[PDB]
Amino acid sequence: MRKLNPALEFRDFIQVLKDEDDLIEITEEIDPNLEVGAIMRKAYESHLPAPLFKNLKGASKDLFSILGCPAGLRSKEKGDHGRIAHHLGLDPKTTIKEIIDYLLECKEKEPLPPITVPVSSAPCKTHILSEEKIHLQSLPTPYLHVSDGGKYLQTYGMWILQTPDKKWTNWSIARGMVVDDKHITGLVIKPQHIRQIADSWAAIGKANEIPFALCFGVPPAAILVSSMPIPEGVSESDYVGAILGESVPVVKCETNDLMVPATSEMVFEGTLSLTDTHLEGPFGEMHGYVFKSQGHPCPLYTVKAMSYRDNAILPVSNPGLCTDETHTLIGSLVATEAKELAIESGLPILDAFMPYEAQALWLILKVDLKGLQALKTTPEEFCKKVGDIYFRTKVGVLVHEIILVADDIDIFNFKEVIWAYVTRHTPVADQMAFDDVPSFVLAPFVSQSSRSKTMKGGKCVTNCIFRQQYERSFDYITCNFEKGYPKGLVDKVNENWKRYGYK
Amino acid sequence: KLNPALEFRDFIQVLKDEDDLIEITEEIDPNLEVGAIMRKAYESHLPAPLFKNLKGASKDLFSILGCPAGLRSKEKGDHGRIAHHLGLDPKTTIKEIIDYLLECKEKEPLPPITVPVSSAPCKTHILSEEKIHLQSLPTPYLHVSDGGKYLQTYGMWILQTPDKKWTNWSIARGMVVDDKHITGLVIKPQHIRQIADSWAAIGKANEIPFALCFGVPPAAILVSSMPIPEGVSESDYVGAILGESVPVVKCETNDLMVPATSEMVFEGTLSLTDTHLEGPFGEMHGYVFKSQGHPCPLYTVKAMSYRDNAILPVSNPGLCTDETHTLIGSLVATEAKELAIESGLPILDAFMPYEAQALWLILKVDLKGLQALKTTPEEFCKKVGDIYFRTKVGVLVHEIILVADDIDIFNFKEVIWAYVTRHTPVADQMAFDDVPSFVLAPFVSQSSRSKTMKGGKCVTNCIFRQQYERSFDYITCNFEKGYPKGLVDKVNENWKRYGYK
């Protein structure tokens, strides 16, 4: 009967999903080999309750259950974005626009650094394993997609890296697969800011012994912020503190000086090496494919210690076709920072969104026509201005098409977006290519093309604003039921619908 | 037995039998209310409304059937209304509908058969010149800011040369002008001269006979909406589709032959020198653009004939999905597949997704057949676009999208996935700058291109470059395609046992 705080406590997050009939406790035996992933895919794709696998083949009492689909969508009556809202402590019926706007509001709140709590107050310290007890291959790690390169333990946990300084601490979410009984490999240090952390340990001669922690079931607000392209120099932990209104509670690792969320379900500790590598991938990814390929070497992470809760739970994300966490979190958090960038640059943008149906490749910008008309500009000048602002930033990396639409389009409703897309831009003539900007390595039309090795271009800005809308008012009828007819007539028809004979 | 392809009233009966028709006996206003009710039904794929009590109607003139080819629930067969136009099983898929139309082109055409007037329901009531009062009919005002009441949204114009050598069944929009006249753009700019001059060549330049028929055999309204090749007889193709001749009777005031079981027949003459502004009309792309009015020739109604309790079928175009998408779009797709077959292109199927407002044509490419061409994307996009945009089939199409044969092009979930993930913006799009633009496309009509009417089309390659060489294997990461059939079955079998509903 406690007051639940789902942004702060992963177990409160599970409880609120229980209370909202949005979680199935599966007690049948489920195989981590493919069965988990297929069940989650069925659930994602019909917007069904999240599965909690309590009986995985090969699990011990404490290691582990699996919570699938932590930010999948659900039925509209419950609040279809409820799982995302719960990562922020918001009402389950909060809209995605309200979620984005709240994240922007939190950039103005007091940032709060983490607070250390007594280890006796830290559930993640209930059980502690030393090196000789580390046995990664005995864990019920899921094999999520056919042809995945291995079992991906890390799809919804948080990597922690820090300079020897302690001046810079990074929380991130790169995928990670199990290599053998003692090692993991993943793309944690691909982004340049995280590689610099790694380099700072090499400068002291620890290039093969960079400490890391990997934490599962962290405060949901922390996993969300770890998935955000927040500006450089902003501390992730302190922004999480701002979202929660309180500091993240942390404790020190057993084997290094890193601090981990005290309520983590499980914490893996060790060191990564810049010299020792192993082939990584492939992995079924956010654009809906597992592509077969030679595979690429990635740094090796050696696990040297572990700590975990009783009856620990591994949160799992199984990416693919819409809609999963790579769309509801990665795409919508890019949209959040795209709205921020618009506000800071003075562009006349009301909202931004990355439609799930476009696999987080399309960024829709809803343009305030009053503001646009005051610029007294041309589509070509505006498309250049917009593309130049976005495609040279961390925010624009994953985005391959920016779509400009007038303020009469609900950009959160793909029915309105696809209509505006097909009817308001001339193919090719209304698209401006950006040939020189960094391409997104994962986009399938990039990775399956010669552009995978030049890594430049293949982006555009698409103008779906009518020419007249750059200049003055343009009054047209939208020919559907709700927008096409007098509101009182719509009322009368809705009120008499059953009297007519309809269900 | 019921023959819904031959008989409009059998068509209504089968929808009733399939729990897919609501008889509305509440009084409904033809001014906006009919249109609003049909939009609600289209957009949630609900039963067709049959308005039996229109404000201002007489006993016989008329009821309105809305949404005659709208979509319905999947368990009923979501394309059942279209299937019934052709006499096919209600659960027939759209691919099977298209392939049936294609097979019927290879069948012996069957010309119409004249039946006696006593056996023609459309002759049950006859109104001569002195009883024509079009303003007394409960014609709908379908969209806000339409230019007038549109009587003709789901009927059939019939025109013919005096030779009786050229006959045309067509579907241009028709607006009521006043108590005696209608207006619309029935004659295309490619026929205007031969019809004008041929009727002028007997002193009848301003007196071209026409008939306008409603509630025709559903196979005929379908064929009338189809861009079949020039020179093909619409009536004889309808006959091949039906497996029997269409029964016809002659008009009262001219020698045109009309379907004997038509609900209503309007007849008269056209004048080319006398014009009236027509439109705007809410159309296939989802807009009324206000004040846009354009001059059209004037049609004088001189006689009318109709059944007891006559029924006007009505289409109310707008946002997807309505007849401009399920019929106009899919019939362009049908002819697009025929053109692929005749030109030797390696195309399995063609479709115009309803969500793209009949502006996108998806072509499902046989990857083996493509690889045998030993070609490149640039060459293949050029070849495809050149073939399609020099034909009448390509007119309404502004983007042709090429996808591999792993895509179910009839499912927009797979289409949008392939579109966004398999083409590089701009780089994988070939513009066609000189081909005729579609006058109605909003990005054309609301731009300077409306004056030039060339270009603004493209072919978009959504086939991975390597698929031109070999059909490389990748995993599609969803439930039904991503996992072995045995696992999919087991998960579905155990779903409720897990605890799901």
Domain boundaries of chain A, sorted by first residue? 10-316, 346-472
Name every residue whose Cβ is closer than 8 Å to that of residue A482 and which is 6 or more positions away in sequence: A490
Interior angle at CA A455, CA A449 and CA A456, nearest 5: 105
How far apart CA A413 and CA A398 sit, in angstroms, is: 21
How far apart CA A495 and CA A454 sit, in angstroms, is: 60
How far apart CA A91 and CA A227 sit, in angstroms, is: 21
Report the first-to-last Cα separation within chain A, whole angstroms: 41
Q: Which CATH superfamily is domain A346-472 in?
A: UbiD C-terminal domain-like (3.40.1670.10)
Peptide bond into B280 cis (omega under 30): yes
Report the DSSP pairing between strands A313-316 and A65-68: parallel
Interface with A, mutate which of B424, B429, B457, B476 (most A CBs under 10 A): B424
- Do residues A11 and B463 touch, judged by C-beta distance below 8 A? no
Binding residue per annotation — A172?
yes
Interface with A, mutate which of B50, B360, B479, B496 (most A CBs under 10 A): B479
Q: Which residues of B are catalytic?
A: 283
Q: What is the CATH number of domain B8-314?
A: 2.30.110.10
CATH architecture of B344-447+455-470: 3-Layer(aba) Sandwich (3.40)
Do domains B8-314 and B344-447+455-470 share one topology? The answer is no
Which residues, listed in sequence order, are joined to residue B212 by a DSSP beta bridge?
B157, B266
Binding residue per annotation — A392?
no
Peptide bond into B321 cis (omega under 30): yes
Q: Quick one: which of A54, A51, A52, A49 has its CA closest to A29?
A: A54
C-alpha distance from B41 to closest chain A C-alpha (Å): 9
- Do residues B239 and B255 touch, judged by C-beta distance below 8 A? no
Peptide bond into A323 cis (omega under 30): yes
C-alpha distance from B130 to closest chain A C-alpha (Å): 37
How far apart CA B399 and CA B426 sit, in angstroms, is: 13
Is residue A33 within 8 angstroms of chain B, CB to CB? no
How far, in Å, are A30, A331, A439 from residue A337 at the CA level?
A: 39, 10, 19
In chain A, residues 457-486 whose CB comes closer than 8 Å to chain B = 457-460, 462, 466-468, 475-481, 484-486
Structure tokens at B305: 């004939």
How far apart CA B321 and CA B328 sit, in angstroms, is: 11
Is A321–B498 a contact, with Cβ atoms under 8 angstroms apart? no
Q: Quote the distance between the C-alpha of residue A238 and its chain's center.
A: 19
In chain A, residues 249-288 whose CB comes closer than 8 Å to chain B = 284-285, 287-288
**CB-side exposure of B430: number of CA atoms within 13 Å?**
20
C-alpha distance from B212 to closest chain A C-alpha (Å): 26
CATH topology of domain A10-316: Pnp Oxidase; Chain A (2.30.110)
Q: Quote the distance between the C-alpha of residue B316 and its chain's center.
A: 12
Q: Quick one: which of A441, A363, A129, A139 has its CA closest to A254?
A: A129
How far apart CA B385 and CA B366 sit, in angstroms, is: 17
Name every residue whose Cβ is closer than 8 Å to that of residue A208 and which is 6 or more positions away in sequence: A271, A273, A274, A275, A276
Is residue B446 within 8 angstroms of chain A, CB to CB? yes
How far apart CA B92 and CA B102 sit, in angstroms, is: 15
A480: number of Cβ within 10 Å: 20
Burial of A78 (C-beta count, 10 Å sphere; 0-12/13-18/19+): middle
Is residue B417 within 8 angstroms of chain A, CB to CB? yes
**Chain A positions in Cβ-Cβ contact with residue B479 (cut-off 8 Å):** 38, 41-42, 45
> Which of helix, strand or coil describes residue B366?
coil
Minimal Cα distance from B430: which residue of A? A428
How far apart CA A266 and CA A285 sit, in angstroms, is: 24
